[PDB]
Amino acid sequence: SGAIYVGNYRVVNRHLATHNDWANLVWEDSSRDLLVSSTTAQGCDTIARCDCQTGVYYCSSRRKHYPVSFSKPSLIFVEASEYYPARYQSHLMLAVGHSEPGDCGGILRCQHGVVGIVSTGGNGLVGFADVRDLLWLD
Numbered sequence: 001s002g003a004i005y006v007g008n009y010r011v012v013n014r015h016l017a018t019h020n021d022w023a024n025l026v027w028e029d030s031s032r033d034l035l036v037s038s039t040t041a042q043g044c045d046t047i048a049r050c051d052c053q054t055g056v057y058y059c060s061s062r063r064k065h066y067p068v069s070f071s072k073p074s075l076i077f078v079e080a081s082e083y084y085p086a087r088y089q090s091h092l093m094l095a096v097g098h099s100e101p102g103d104c105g106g107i108l109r110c111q112h113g114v115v116g117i118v119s120t121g122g123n124g125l126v127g128f129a130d131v132r133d134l135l136w137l138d
């Protein structure tokens with residue numbers, strides 16, 4: 001679990017979005033596994049504006065932050081886990097690291113701020129949904 005809170009926006013994994021998220025829907029993209037909902041209170045996160053390919057992510061299944069190199073956002077086939085199998089996800093970045101069911105919503109950050117949230121994992125890879133192209137979140 002986990003979310004990004006920037007201005008009056010909450011960014012979550014679309015598949016973890018709550019009733020409240022869908023009641024306050026601003027924007028969702030099935031192909032990116034992202035949903036943005038409106039918040040009453042002000043968020044304190046800043047979104048990175050950069051093409052950083054290094055940063056640090058939070059891994060809840062290890063209670064640890066890991067530094068990683070990660071690929072530029074791309075269209076990628078995500079193999080089966082305990083969710084919908086071999087699905088195509090856009091704006092996805094991969095790194096070598098640990099990701100396990102429950103690690104979704106972990107934030108990936110660089111010196112510029114928030115890059116993305118954990119979305120996929122397995123086989124020693126971690127996938128992050130990029131948010132940096134969503135300039136409107138600012």
Ligand SMILES: O=C(CN1CCCC1)c1ccccc1Cl
Nearest residue numbers: 081099100101102103104120121
């Ligand atoms: O964190 C998740 C997604 N869900 C969050 C709560 C149940 C799982 C995940 C991470 C890595 C690999 C596969 C998955 Cl499903």
Ligand SMILES: [Zn+2]
Nearest residue numbers: 050052110112
């Ligand atoms: Zn950066």
